[PDB]
Amino acid sequence: SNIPLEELQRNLQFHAFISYSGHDSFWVKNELLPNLEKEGMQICLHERNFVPGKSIVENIITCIEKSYKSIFVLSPNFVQSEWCHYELYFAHHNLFHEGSNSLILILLEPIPQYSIPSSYHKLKSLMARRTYLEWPKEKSKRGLFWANLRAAINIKLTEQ
Numbered sequence: 001s002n003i004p005l006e007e008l009q010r011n012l013q014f015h016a017f018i019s020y021s022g023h024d025s026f027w028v029k030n031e032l033l034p035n036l037e038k039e040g041m042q043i044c045l046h047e048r049n050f051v052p053g054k055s056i057v058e059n060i061i062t063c064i065e066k067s068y069k070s071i072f073v074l075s076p077n078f079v080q081s082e083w084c085h086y087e088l089y090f091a092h093h094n095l096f097h098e099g100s101n102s103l104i105l106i107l108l109e110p111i112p113q114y115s116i117p118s119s120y121h122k123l124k125s126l127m128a129r130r131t132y133l134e135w136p137k138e139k140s141k142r143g144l145f146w147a148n149l150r151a152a153i154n155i156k157l158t159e160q
Contacts, residue, residue, distance in 0.1 A: 002041060015068050016068065019046055019060065021077035087123060105126060
């Protein structure tokens with residue numbers, strides 16, 4: 001019931017790469033990863049999988065290149081401690097060709113406008129699309145979130 005990565009055009013190793021902030025580690029390790037790995041998905045994680053002897057940027061790009069999708073756990077913590085790596089890399093490399101299925105945005109916590117610096121142009125461009133999956137506060141809507149998340153991971157990539 002999951003995408004066979006070996007039957008893809010590229011030699012991908014993971015179904016999705018999860019980029020998150022350390023301050024959001026509890027939800028990622030007790031909700032995100034359990035719900036994805038129990039379904040049989042291979043996850044490139046921000047903590048593990050990173051190879052020693054390389055920079056943090058190289059480890060992130062390596063996880064992205066070996067993953068069918070990339071997941072950003074958007075939150076005030078993610079903006080202040082994680083997004084800068086992507087804002088700097090997007091200024092020179094546009095590997096996510098705009099409107100593409102490659103990037104999946106999870107809004108774990110609402111991001112206030114004041115906490116977003118005026119220099120994070122790509123972050124404002126991504127959140128303006130209103131295509132992110134919001135973590136619901138109601139427990140009854142949790143099952144809808146996971147169904148939407150697994151679908152976003154397993155949907156066919158748009159031609160980019």
